[PDB]
Amino acid sequence: SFVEDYLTKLQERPTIIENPNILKGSKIFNAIYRVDDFVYIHIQSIKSEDGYNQYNVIEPPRPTHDEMEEIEEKFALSIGDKKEKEKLIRSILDKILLRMRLSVPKEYVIYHFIRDKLYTGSLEPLIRDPYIEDISIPGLGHVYIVHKVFGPMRTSIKFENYEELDNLIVSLSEKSYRPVSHNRPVVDASLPDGSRVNFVYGVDISRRGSNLTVRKRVPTSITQLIMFGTLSSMMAAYIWTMLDEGMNLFVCGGKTTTLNAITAFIPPNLKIVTIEDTPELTVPHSNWVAEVTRETGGEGTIKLFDLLKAALRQRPNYILVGEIRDKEGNVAFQAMQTGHSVMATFHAANITTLIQRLTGYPIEVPKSYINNLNIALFQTALYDKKGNLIRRVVEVDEIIDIDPVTNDVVYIPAFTYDSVQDKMLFAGKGSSYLIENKIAVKRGIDRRNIGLLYDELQMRSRFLNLLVEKKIFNYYDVWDYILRARQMGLEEAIKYVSNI
Amino acid sequence: SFVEDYLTKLQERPTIIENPNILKGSKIFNAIYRVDDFVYIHIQSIKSEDGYNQYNVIEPPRPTHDEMEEIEEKFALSIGDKEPPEDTKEKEKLIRSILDKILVPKEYVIYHFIRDKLYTGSLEPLIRDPYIEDISIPGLGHVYIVHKVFGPMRTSIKFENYEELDNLIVSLSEKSYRPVSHNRPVVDASLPDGSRVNFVYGVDISRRGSNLTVRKRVPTSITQLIMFGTLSSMMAAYIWTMLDEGMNLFVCGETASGKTTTLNAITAFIPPNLKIVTIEDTPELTVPHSNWVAEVTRETGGEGTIKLFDLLKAALRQRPNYILVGEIRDKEGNVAFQAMQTGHSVMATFHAANITTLIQRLTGYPIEVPKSYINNLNIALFQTALYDKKGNLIRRVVEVDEIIDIDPVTNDVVYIPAFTYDSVQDKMLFAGKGSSYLIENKIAVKRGIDRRNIGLLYDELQMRSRFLNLLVEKKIFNYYDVWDYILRARQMGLEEAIKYVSNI
Amino acid sequence: LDNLIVSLSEKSYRPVSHNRPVVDASLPDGSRVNFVYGVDISRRGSNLTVRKRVPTSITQLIMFGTLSSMMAAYIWTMLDEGMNLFVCGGKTTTLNAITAFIPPNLKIVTIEDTPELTVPHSNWVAEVTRETGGEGTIKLFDLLKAALRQRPNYILVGEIRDKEGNVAFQAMQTGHSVMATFHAANITTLIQRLTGYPIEVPKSYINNLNIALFQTALYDKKGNLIRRVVEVDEIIDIDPVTNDVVYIPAFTYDSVQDKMLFAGKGSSYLIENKIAVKRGIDRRNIGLLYDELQMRSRFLNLLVEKKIFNYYDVWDYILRARQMGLEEAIKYVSNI
CA distance C160 to chain B (A): 18
Whether residue B374 contacts residue B406, with contact meaning beta carbons closer than 8 Å, is answered with yes
Residues of chain B in contact with residue A52, where contact means CB-CB under 8 angstroms, are: 272-273, 290
Pairing mode, strands B276-280 and B292-296: parallel
- Give the relative orientation of helices A475-488 and A450-469 as an angle to the nearest 10 degrees: 140
Residue type, A156: S
Whether residue B167 contacts residue B174, with contact meaning beta carbons closer than 8 Å, is answered with no
Sketch the domain layout of chain A as residue ranges: 1-61+120-216, 62-119, 217-500
Whether residue B353 contacts residue B382, with contact meaning beta carbons closer than 8 Å, is answered with yes
Element (H, E) at A22: none
Residue type, A57: V
Closest residue by Cα to residue A355 from A326, A376, A332 = A376
Pairing mode, strands B393-406 and B413-422: antiparallel
Which residues in chain B (376-405) have CB-CB distances under 8 A to chain C?
386-387
Give the span between the Cα atoms of A397 and A374, in whole angstroms: 8
Give the span between the Cα atoms of B399 and A347, in whole angstroms: 36
Do B304 and A387 lie within an 8 Å CB cutoff?
Answer: no
Q: Which residues pair with B498 in a beta bridge?
A: none
CA dihedral A251, A255, A256, A257 (to 10 degrees): -110
CATH class of B62-119: mainly alpha
The answer to whether residue A202 neighbours chain B at the CB level (below 8 Å) is: no
Segments in A312-411 forming alpha helices (H): 327-336, 351-359, 367-370
Give the span between the Cα atoms of B376 and B345, in whole angstroms: 10
Q: Closest CB to C125: pick one of B185, B188, B206.
A: B206
In degrees rounded to 5, what are phi and psi of residue A168?
A: -70, -60
HSE value, Cβ hemisphere, 13 Å, CA-based, for B198: 23
CATH class of C53-336: alpha beta
Q: What b/e string do you get for A70-84 counting C-beta neighbours within 10 Å, with b at 16 or more?
A: ebeeebeeeeeeeee
The answer to whether residue B433 neighbours chain C at the CB level (below 8 Å) is: no
Do B207 and C103 lie within an 8 Å CB cutoff?
Answer: no
Smallest CA–CA distance from A52 into chain B, residue: B273
Do B152 and C106 lie within an 8 Å CB cutoff?
Answer: yes
What secondary structure does DSSP assign to A439-462, as a single string? IHHHTT--GGGHHHHHHHHHHHHH
Segments in B341-419 forming alpha helices (H): 355-363, 371-374
Non-local (6+) Cβ contacts of B11 within 8 A are: none
What secondary structure does DSSP assign to A279-307, as a single string? ------SSSEEEEE-B--SSTT-B-HHHH
Whether residue B329 contacts residue C175, with contact meaning beta carbons closer than 8 Å, is answered with no
Smallest CA–CA distance from B365 into chain C, residue: C204
Whether residue B136 contacts residue B143, with contact meaning beta carbons closer than 8 Å, is answered with yes
In degrees rounded to 5, what are phi and psi of residue B269?
A: -80, -15
Q: Closest CB to A208: pick one of B292, B304, B343.
A: B292
Whether residue C155 contacts residue C171, with contact meaning beta carbons closer than 8 Å, is answered with yes
Give the span between the Cα atoms of A77 and A93, in whole angstroms: 12
Whether residue A152 contacts residue B273, with contact meaning beta carbons closer than 8 Å, is answered with yes
| Ramachandran sector of residue B199 (left: φ over 0; alpha: ψ -120 to 50; beta: rest) | beta
Residue type, C62: I
Whether residue B253 contacts residue B384, with contact meaning beta carbons closer than 8 Å, is answered with yes
Give the span between the Cα atoms of B33 and B421, in whole angstroms: 38
Non-local (6+) Cβ contacts of C184 within 8 A are: C88, C89, C190, C193, C214
Q: For residue C100, what are the CA distances in angstroms to A243, C82, C94, C318?
A: 73, 13, 11, 8
Smallest CA–CA distance from B291 into chain A, residue: A138
Q: Which residues pair with C130 in a beta bridge?
A: C138
Flag whether B touches C (3+ CB pairs, 8 A cutoff).
Answer: yes
Give the span between the Cα atoms of B59 and B157, in whole angstroms: 11
Q: Which residues pair with C173 in a beta bridge?
A: none
Residue C225 burial class via C-beta count within 10 angstroms: exposed 0-12, middle 13-18, buried 19 and up: exposed
In degrees rounded to 5, what are phi and psi of residue B227?
A: -75, -30
| Residues recorded for chain A | 500
| Ramachandran sector of residue A301 (left: φ over 0; alpha: ψ -120 to 50; beta: rest) | beta
Do C127 and B184 lie within an 8 Å CB cutoff?
Answer: no
Whether residue A26 contacts residue A43, with contact meaning beta carbons closer than 8 Å, is answered with no
Whether residue B337 contacts residue B369, with contact meaning beta carbons closer than 8 Å, is answered with yes
Number of H helices, E strands in chain C: 13, 14
Q: Which sign does the torsion angle of CA A347, A352, A355, A358 carry? A: negative
Q: For residue C154, what are the CA distances in angstroms to C119, C180, C336?
A: 11, 10, 33
Give the span between the Cα atoms of B109 and B115, in whole angstroms: 10
CA distance A165 to chain B (A): 14
Tell me, rounded to whole angstroms, the distance of Cα A408 from its chain centroid.
36
Q: Closest CB to A134: pick one of B298, B319, B446.
A: B319
SS3 per residue for B258-270: CHHHHHHHHHHHC
3-class SS of residue B74: helix
HSE value, Cβ hemisphere, 13 Å, CA-based, for B97: 7
The answer to whether residue C16 neighbours chain B at the CB level (below 8 Å) is: no
| Chain B with chain C: Cβ pairs closer than 8 A | 102
The answer to whether residue C11 neighbours chain B at the CB level (below 8 Å) is: no
Residues of chain B in contact with residue C280, where contact means CB-CB under 8 angstroms, are: 386-387
3-class SS of residue A375: strand
3-class SS of residue A146: strand
| Residues recorded for chain B | 504
Which residues in chain B (310-329) have CB-CB distances under 8 A to chain A?
310-311, 314, 317-319
Question: Would you call the peptide bond into B219 cis, given omega within 30 degrees of 0 as the criterion?
Answer: no
Query: Per the annotation, does A345 bind a ligand?
Result: no
Give the CA angle between residues B462, B468, B471 to the nearest 5°. Answer: 145
Residue type, A38: F
Non-local (6+) Cβ contacts of B342 within 8 A are: A381, A389, B316
CATH class of B217-504: alpha beta
Closest residue by Cα to residue A235 from A465, A3, A492 = A465
The answer to whether residue B366 neighbours chain C at the CB level (below 8 Å) is: yes
Q: For residue B227, what are the CA distances in angstroms to B220, B470, B474, B476?
A: 11, 11, 12, 11
| Chain A with chain B: Cβ pairs closer than 8 A | 100
Residues A217-500, CATH architecture: 3-Layer(aba) Sandwich (3.40)
Q: Which sign does the torsion angle of CA A445, A451, A455, A460 carry? A: positive
Give the span between the Cα atoms of B77 and B75, in whole angstroms: 5
Hey, which bits of B341-454 come out as E strands?
A: 345-350, 379-387, 393-406, 413-422, 427-430
Non-local (6+) Cβ contacts of B387 within 8 A are: B393, B394, C279, C280
Resolution of the entry in angstroms = 3.6
Residue type, B390: K
Q: Closest CB to B303: pick one of A154, A297, A385.
A: A297
Smallest CA–CA distance from A139 into chain B, residue: B293
Whether residue C127 contacts residue B142, with contact meaning beta carbons closer than 8 Å, is answered with no
Give the span between the Cα atoms of C286 and C191, in whole angstroms: 30
Which residues in chain C (160-199) have CB-CB distances under 8 A to chain B?
173, 175
Smallest CA–CA distance from C121 into chain B, residue: B50
Hey, which bits of B258-392 come out as E strands?
A: 276-280, 292-296, 322-325, 345-350, 379-387
The answer to whether residue A349 neighbours chain B at the CB level (below 8 Å) is: yes
Give the span between the Cα atoms of B483 and B496, in whole angstroms: 17
Residue type, C111: I
What is the edge-to-edge ordering of all strands in the sheet holding C32-36?
Answer: C22-26, C32-36, C47-51
Do C130 and B186 lie within an 8 Å CB cutoff?
Answer: no
Residue A177 burial class via C-beta count within 10 angstroms: exposed 0-12, middle 13-18, buried 19 and up: exposed
Which residues in chain B (446-475) have CB-CB distances under 8 A to chain C?
none
Breaks (C-N over 2.5 A) in chain B follow: 103, 216
Q: Which residues pair with B382 in a beta bridge?
A: B252, B399
Q: For residue B445, what are the CA distances in angstroms to B176, B416, C198?
A: 52, 19, 53
Q: Does domain B1-61+120-216 sit in CATH 3.30.450.370?
A: yes
Tell me, rounded to whole angstroms, the distance of Cα B30 from its chain centroid.
28
Give the span between the Cα atoms of A288 and A243, in whole angstroms: 16
